[PDB]
Amino acid sequence: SYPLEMCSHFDADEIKRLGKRFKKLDLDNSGSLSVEEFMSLPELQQNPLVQRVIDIFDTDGNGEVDFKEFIEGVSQFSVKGDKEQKLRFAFRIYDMDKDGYISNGELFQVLKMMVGNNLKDTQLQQIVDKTIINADKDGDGRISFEEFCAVVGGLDIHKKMVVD
């Protein structure tokens, strides 16, 4: 009992199919996806961005992705998604504490997970610095979703963040 409310681009059929994959991933059948359950896929153990996505899919910060969260997060990539929505998702890969601003420490932390050790921390930090300096058009020492948009707009990476 009790309908489940959720905002998404999918029709009833697509909500059912994804409803099945969610059950298969739901190891302990608890109605919510855990990281160990996410990491159950081998292709995902070799991905530095899994935890970022998951914390982005996790809207109510309880460490699990329930069905509403899973659907609505898989929806950001729906081919039907606009341009802004796909940047927004990208913007979120950087804003860790979800305050709507990418910080100097946050930009460093995220980047490091991806670059790892092919860059001394000193090197990564410098370019993080230099990146925020030219992009901080308001001088608040951090990047806004707008400033972010001003630097990555014509890259068109949102066209790649599409799944079926």
Binding site: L41, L44, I93, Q126, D129, I157
Partner: protein, 352 residues
């Protein structure tokens, strides 16, 4: 713990003293924290020194005691050391054989500083023209884009006009022909060079292109033929001169040796075959860019010709601030990586 670049852009007053003289110790310090000078400030320096350059002869005449330098290629912090090694230019006669831009990512800094120092000591410090002092190469390489990131397209233009005033060569202590590239099938006497019109983008052929672009034969000194010039398949232009070509120009011109940069040397220099007449190296190459491109692991070197002693000073690379390719910003940089891995994750998650 990582020093952070200085937001304040130097002023005319902070750069030039009341007599109009450049305050080089001030300048030099700002530049090492990666700082910049207000556009005009820079443009002034760039234009003041080019006037001094347009006034100088195609072939300079420089008297020992002198310190000769090779390519610098934007490695600003390897320049700061070349100066600690070659001695204060307040009390030392210099001569850079060219290539101060492109390759390294601090090409403008080098330029601004070397230009400011040409102003301050116009009768001691001498700069020549290198292959990289020209539109066609700075467009392909990162100087142009560099200029636009740090400054503007105007500054880049200021420089391009300047470079056209760079002396094509120098006759050092009446014994050496100091060039960047090499000889020309068309340049037989020191007089020929004097007749050339140098104020232009180097031609895609001819004596000026050859001055700047000629290279000695890979087997220079032991070539199997007494042939002089053969087209440079390495540069794709100009020529590969030979040991005979050189000794014929040297003798005819009563010169001792040729001193050029242009090619990278693991030791930061290279002495070529000794002239049968003199027993001195007919040709000398000198590279002043240590650990070129950050991976060559090559030593750098200046040449010090004093008290009838040509002493080769070698130095190693020094530390410099990181910079992604084409002065890219970390978002442009990682967004493709991000947009692929997240795509990748969902794709495995939905194919569950």
């Amino acid at each position: 713990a990582v020093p952070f670049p200085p937001s304040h852009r130097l002023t005319a007053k902070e750069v030039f003293d009341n007599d109009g003289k450049p305050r080089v110790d001030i300048l030099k310090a700002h530049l090492m924290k990666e700082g910049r000078l207000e556009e005009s400030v820079a443009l002034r320096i760039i234009t003041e020194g080019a006037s001094i350059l347009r006034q100088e002869k195609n072939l300079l005449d420089i008297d020992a005691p002198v310190t000769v330098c090779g390519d610098i290629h934007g490695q600003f912090f390897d320049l700061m050391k070349l100066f600690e090694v070659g001695g204060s230019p307040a009390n030392t006669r210099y001569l850079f054989l060219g290539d101060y831009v492109d390759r390294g990512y601090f090409s403008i800094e080098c330029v601004l500083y070397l230009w400011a120092l040409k102003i301050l000591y116009p009768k001691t410090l001498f700069l020549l023209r290198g292959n990289h002092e020209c539109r066609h190469l700075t467009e392909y390489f990162t100087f142009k884009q560099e200029c636009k990131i740090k400054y503007s397209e105007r500054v880049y233009d200021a420089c391009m006009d300047a470079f056209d005033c760079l002396p094509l060569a120098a006759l050092m202590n009446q014994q050496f022909l100091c060039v960047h590239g090499g000889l020309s099938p068309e340049i037989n006497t020191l007089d020929d060079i004097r007749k050339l019109d140098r104020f232009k983008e180097p031609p895609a052929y001819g004596p000026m292109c050859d001055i700047l672009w000629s290279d000695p034969l890979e087997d220079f000194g032991n070539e199997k033929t007494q042939e002089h010039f053969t087209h440079n398949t390495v540069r794709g232009c100009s020529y590969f001169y030979s040991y005979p070509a050189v000794c014929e120009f040297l003798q005819h011109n009563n010169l001792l040796s040729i001193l050029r940069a242009h090619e990278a040397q693991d030791a930061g220099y290279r002495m070529y075959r000794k002239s049968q007449t003199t027993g001195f190296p007919s040709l000398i190459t000198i590279f002043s860019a240590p650990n070129y491109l950050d991976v060559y692991n090559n030593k750098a070197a200046v040449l010090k010709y004093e008290n009838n002693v040509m002493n080769i000073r070698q130095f190693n690379c020094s530390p410099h601030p990181y910079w992604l390719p084409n002065f890219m910003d970390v978002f442009t940089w990682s967004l493709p990586f991000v947009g692929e891995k997240v795509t990748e994750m969902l794709v495995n998650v939905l194919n569950i």
